[PDB]
């Protein structure tokens, strides 16, 4: 694989990264809205995300990685768990169905650090098992208990003690008509015995787990099988309990099972499964290749090294098992009598073949020259590598380069060479990361604004630009200091500074003789605008007007006086308070409600405005809504705007 | 075939894409009436220009394909469809007439499965079993019936079930008179036991079809015979039925048939229903060549892939006869005893001929530096083509080229030479598709702007120009970034953006100073009841105080009168009409609307009643709604009540 | 694309801040005001009316007072508006948020009598950054 | 940058007329009209005052009037341009 593609790759990722951020924020506005039905189509929206990275040809581990941390840096994921756990869920189920979902999609080796440190786990694991009325509902739990059992050795021991094992086989027995559930079981159980202590495996044998991985081995899904296979094995790898899988029979069920398959025909089958399978988890199942283990042990993973390699080769990551040691396991096997173990231990090998030279840093500015070489080697300037050497150039030199640079100093005459040079460059310096030097995410607005002005990051922000003085610039510092030429480039960021600008809610007081078609307009327009707008009418039925009209006002946050034709003469004088406009007023100024005074087609102020009692007078000196009928909507804006702030 | 000639076709072939979907546009503007006339003038339009587009020499058939598809991206296929199954299209059979010519048209193997794919298959078969008044709808019916057989043999094998084959023998026993009705029956024939299993052919043969194609093979008409050549030799390349065509007789024909003709002399008449035969009907046909079958099948299949052949090099697609292998049993039959079989053959390989260097993708960015060699030594650059080796010039780097580059970097020195190159490169950028890269279809947009423009599109894409920006660039922008240094260019696309600018349910009557609010809210009610509610505020186009209030009253069903205090009070003596309310009133009498009036908690009638104009005075009679703001909800049942009756 | 038909004593500021508004907004918003060169009524003020698409009829108080009896338009916002009139222009009266459509409107002359009965944008100050918007939906249509 | 005060009924379409005039003039003009929200009348008239550098006072038929012994500040045009 060619440093193009690590370039393309890394490209690609820095882009697609960028991309689902954002739809994952729009994801979660609508999960925000804690709502159920937003939340099981931002959740949904999620997963289909998810999947679908998982599906990206090359950089979907990394993406799906990326994803998780951007998850938790968000504290998405966090809102998902509690979203999950709350007992609130159980007005709908499908929330924490979607929720869990995402959380099975998103559960990583940190994810799961995450739940731990955070001590989520055991309230996960109780909600997982509640999490049992359909099919659908067992096979999640099974994945979220199978996925918590990816955790170290004593999060798997803690969790025997909630005797989860017999939830797990109750699970699988109600339901085999499902063969999901089944590998959702199988996986559950490889997982804690791959990530269990002895006490704990030997625990986990006792619920009769050597004669239902028989059954699950019996059953004719060969991922079930698969799963059933490594966990046996993972319990044939312990001297102790060698006999009581000899009792299970399920070692005569493995070889055979491995016989009428090829890793690479299981894995494109496997690969929904597959999808984060992880280097801790390999580093558990290597000691099952070794020569003191049973031939059928280091065939189920001689199998699976070989189906990890046709997937790491995919993903550009084979490093992994020299990373592990795992390739010497592999000779050894290879060199070993166990011809089925051997013929897949030497197809892994096979698939192993040679590493690559460097694995480039997206912290381009990083690079030594040696990187640089490699890089222009690989792009296909060979001929000018010695030169480059020459002059000692650097990841930072890179990202300064100019065409002079080219024509002079590495002698580049050709313009047409330039100009393919160019673009790789610019191709790079848009790929490479810059947060090693990047304090305010500027290149993550940038790429916010549109992936390709990534190219512009370096040079301003080595200019000492930053993501809080962008307002600021002229087109000509744009252009000229910052060297963003393209005038199109300078009004795409230009519109981002164009566009740097811009219970009860309501109780409607009034004049019955005057005010009613009108207060009545305004509680249901304000309805119509969502507001939880109450009105006399709403408030006084079959009833006194009783000290429960001041507690809605007391409830409400703001208060409309509609100031009528003729509504406020009879508070002149009123300092008895009889009037109800005037209790209603008085009480709203007491408890410092947001006071609209509204002045309607055909209303004035009293003359006598002396005459109107001191403790509601100021009505007549507060800011109002001029009231038209045809210019309604303009008066509705007063409303709005004096009740939103 | 040149890559000049390449070029051209794929240039003529955008550029009439182009041309004809705006011109189907239309069309479909006229179907989108939903009118008679006006529907079958726009499927007559695009039967025709379906028919121009086949008789376009070099690229009809791609062409047409790009529209059928266009077609099915624009629903356009689907509206046909549905404007063809409907019982409502019983309105005009003429409609469902030139609906059906038009998807007879459109009869391409991915609208074939559209039509499958939305279970359109059984209802157009009816609807095309319908189609029966006349000849006409007759050998509509046998080709839409034809063209469903050429769909998998599932497809044919469920149509069998319709017993539609009963229904083919009644149509051209009725009519024998006309030609066109025995070739698409013989076509029917042909198509439906080409794309069928054993048991259907059977099923097919039950009905007396080897008679029939006896019959149709006797027939005069050399189309009808071919198609009855090719129906009973599928049926004789089946071991059971070889006999049932030797007790027909028709074998006897088929050589004869053949003798009296050349592929090329039928292929010149056939043509016009040789537009549009496709891959997979060739790959079945492709087996009626083997040593296994008949001299009569091979001599008929040799016959026929002679004709193919000549077609095939008329639109430069020969490579198929390669794909399918069909060559291999083209040179079995030469070398075959079959020496009719053997010479149709021998001339169909003479057809052959030789492969294409290379075909051109469209997508000229994604051109490897071997396609630009190819491209340069074709134009006639040859002497050139080892320095754009040396240059390492692509796909991308052409659509950079300036005569600067020619000059220098392939040292070009001839500005004659370079015009000629230029011009190449013009027409090529002109030509080459950009859907590889353009998110907006700014392509598609200049090109409906005018074609030429096409060459702008690579450049300003590149700098990052989308379809929403355009409006935005200053001309300096354009001449500049965009390098269009031709004001003219400049000027056209100036025009796009220089001229880019500029029944009722219920009408509510009301006197405007003591109504207002209250016909308002009524509005409001209304409208959340989902009434398109109309009122004296808004409906007036800013002339003289005139009729269209009067028209809104025409339109609306029902009629409210707020009959607020001082409403009808001002219609007393108004005998002479000069009261709005009361030229609203006469008019919703005149027009016999449902009038309510609504009873303001204040309003009476005025005690002078009989100054009320005769016209109007019934409104003192009428059943209406006392509007109580304390009962608002009940109030509006109650009008809702006197709306719906 | 407008003229201002406004009265001189009353509606100035007006009829300014309408075409000044639309200065804000481009609109080319002639005006009473400035279009008279050296003559005996130069009267371009028609030429323009004739130009424009569309004529706002600024009515303030005492706008349409001496319109009245006004039959051979010796005021010039009469001959203003029956221009306006005779061209078939589309015709926007503004009402003042003090204006009242006139009694004695029928001594308004016969050519123009109807501008009373006419459909108009009602105006106030209050909210002069949305009043504006019902003048350019009459313009639009 | 510049308030307008004016007495509301006759500063009026001039009024409105300065502040577009000085908005096509590109000073940020604002007027008594715009600034008044959610509370008490001077509480939000006046603020605009102290942030302005500018005062325009549109003198007009009734733009001094009512400050005629209003030695008790009641006046809004006198709060404004005290």
């Given at each position: 694989m060619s440093n193009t593609e690590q370039v393309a790759m890394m490209h690609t990722l820095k882009t697609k990264l960028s991309k689902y951020q954002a739809m994952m924020d729009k994801a979660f506005e609508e999960i925000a809205k804690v709502e159920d039905a937003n939340i099981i189509e931002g959740c949904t929206i999620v997963r289909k995300l998810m999947r679908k990275v998982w599906n990206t040809p090359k950089v979907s581990a990394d993406l799906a990685n990326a994803l998780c941390d951007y998850l938790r840096d968000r504290d998405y994921f966090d809102k998902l768990i509690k979203m999950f756990i709350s007992p609130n869920t159980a007005a709908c189920d499908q929330v924490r169905m979607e929720c869990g979902k995402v959380l099975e999609e998103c559960t990583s080796s940190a994810n799961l650090e995450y739940i731990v440190n955070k001590s989520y786990t055991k309230k996960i694991m109780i909600v997982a098992m509640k999490l049992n009325k359909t099919p659908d509902q067992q096979r999640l739990s099974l994945s979220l208990i199978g996925n918590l059992f990816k955790h170290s050795n004593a999060v798997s021991l803690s969790l025997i003690e909630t005797d989860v094992i017999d939830h797990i086989i109750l699970t699988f027995k109600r339901a085999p008509e499902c063969p999901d559930i089944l590998r959702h079981a199988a996986l559950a159980l490889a997982n804690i015995l791959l990530y269990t202590c002895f006490e704990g495996k030997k625990k986990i044998i006792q619920k009769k787990i050597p004669e239902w991985l028989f059954f699950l081995a019996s059953q004719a899904d060969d991922v079930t099988r698969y799963y059933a296979c490594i966990a046996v094995c993972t319990i044939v790898s312990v001297k102790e309990?060698?006999?009581?899988?000899?009792?299970?029979?399920?070692?005569?069920?493995?070889?055979?099972?491995?016989?009428?398959?090829?890793?690479?025909?299981?894995?494109?089958?496997?690969?929904?499964?597959?999808?984060?399978?992880?280097?801790?988890?390999?580093?558990?199942?290597?000691?099952?290749?070794?020569?003191?283990?049973?031939?059928?042990?280091?065939?189920?993973?001689?199998?699976?090294?070989?189906?990890?390699?046709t997937i790491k080769k995919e993903q550009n990551k084979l490093d992994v098992f020299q990373e592990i040691g795992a390739i010497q396991a592999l000779k050894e096997v290879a060199s070993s009598p166990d011809e089925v173990a051997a013929k897949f231990a030497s197809e892994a090998l096979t698939v192993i073949g040679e590493e690559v030279p460097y694995?480039?840093?997206?912290?381009?500015?990083?690079?030594?020259?040696?990187?640089?070489?490699?890089?222009?080697?690989?792009?296909?300037?060979?001929?000018?590598?010695?030169?480059?050497?020459?002059?000692?150039?650097?990841?930072?030199?890179?990202?300064?380069?100019?065409?002079?640079?080219?024509?002079?100093?590495?002698?580049?005459?050709?313009?047409?060479?330039?100009?393919?040079?160019?673009?790789?460059?610019?191709?790079?310096?848009?790929?490479?990361?810059?947060?090693?030097?990047?304090?305010?995410?500027?290149?993550?607005?940038?790429?916010?604004?549109?992936?390709?002005?990534?190219?512009?990051?370096?040079?301003?922000?080595?200019?000492?630009?930053?993501?809080?003085?962008?307002?600021?610039?002229?087109?000509?510092?744009?252009?000229?200091?910052?060297?963003?030429?393209?005038?199109?480039?300078?009004?795409?960021?230009?519109?981002?500074?164009?566009?740097?600008?811009?219970?009860?809610?309501?109780?409607?007081?009034?004049?019955?003789?005057?005010?009613?078609?009108?207060?009545?307009?305004?509680?249901?327009?304000?309805?119509?605008?969502?507001?939880?707008?109450?009105?006399?009418?709403?408030?006084?039925?079959?009833?006194?007007?009783?000290?429960?009209?001041?507690?809605?006002?007391?409830?409400?946050?703001?208060?409309?006086?509609?100031?009528?034709?003729?509504?406020?003469?009879?508070?002149?004088?009123?300092?008895?308070?009889?009037?109800?406009?005037?209790?209603?007023?008085?009480?709203?100024?007491?408890?410092?409600?947001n006071i609209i005074p509204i002045f309607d087609t055909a209303f004035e102020f009293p003359t006598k405005e002396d005459q109107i009692p001191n403790d509601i007078r100021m009505i007549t000196k507060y800011n109002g809504v001029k009231w038209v009928h045809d210019y309604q909507d303009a008066c509705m804006a007063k409303v709005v705007r004096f009740i939103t702030g």
């Open positions: 309990f060698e006999p009581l899988v000899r009792k299970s029979d399920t070692m005569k069920l493995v070889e055979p099972f491995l016989q009428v398959h090829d890793p690479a025909t299981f894995a494109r089958d496997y690969h929904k499964y597959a999808q984060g399978n992880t280097k801790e988890w390999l580093e558990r199942l290597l000691p099952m290749l070794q020569p003191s283990r049973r031939r059928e042990a280091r065939s189920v993973a001689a199998f699976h090294f070989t189906l990890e390699a694995k480039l840093a997206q912290q381009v500015p990083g690079w030594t020259c040696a990187d640089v070489q490699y890089w222009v080697k690989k792009i296909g300037f060979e001929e000018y590598v010695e030169k480059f050497a020459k002059q000692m150039v650097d990841g930072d030199l890179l990202l300064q380069l100019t065409e002079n640079d080219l024509k002079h100093d590495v002698g580049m005459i050709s313009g047409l060479h330039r100009k393919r040079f160019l673009r790789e460059l610019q191709t790079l310096k848009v790929a490479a990361d810059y947060s090693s030097v990047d304090e305010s995410n500027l290149d993550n607005f940038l790429m916010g604004l549109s992936p390709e002005l990534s190219v512009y990051t370096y040079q301003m922000l080595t200019n000492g630009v930053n993501r809080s003085l962008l307002s600021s610039l002229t087109d000509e510092m744009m252009q000229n200091a910052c060297g963003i030429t393209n005038p199109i480039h300078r009004l795409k960021l230009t519109q981002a500074f164009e566009t740097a600008k811009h219970q009860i809610d309501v109780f409607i007081s009034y004049r019955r003789s005057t005010g009613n078609q009108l207060a009545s307009l305004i509680k249901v327009l304000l309805q119509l605008r969502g507001y939880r707008v109450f009105i006399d009418v709403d408030k006084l039925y079959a009833g006194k007007f009783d000290s429960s009209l001041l507690k809605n006002i007391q409830a409400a946050k703001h208060f409309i006086l509609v100031l009528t034709p003729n509504s406020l003469d009879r508070l002149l004088n009123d300092d008895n308070c009889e009037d109800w406009v005037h209790k209603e007023l008085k009480c709203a100024f007491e408890h410092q409600k």
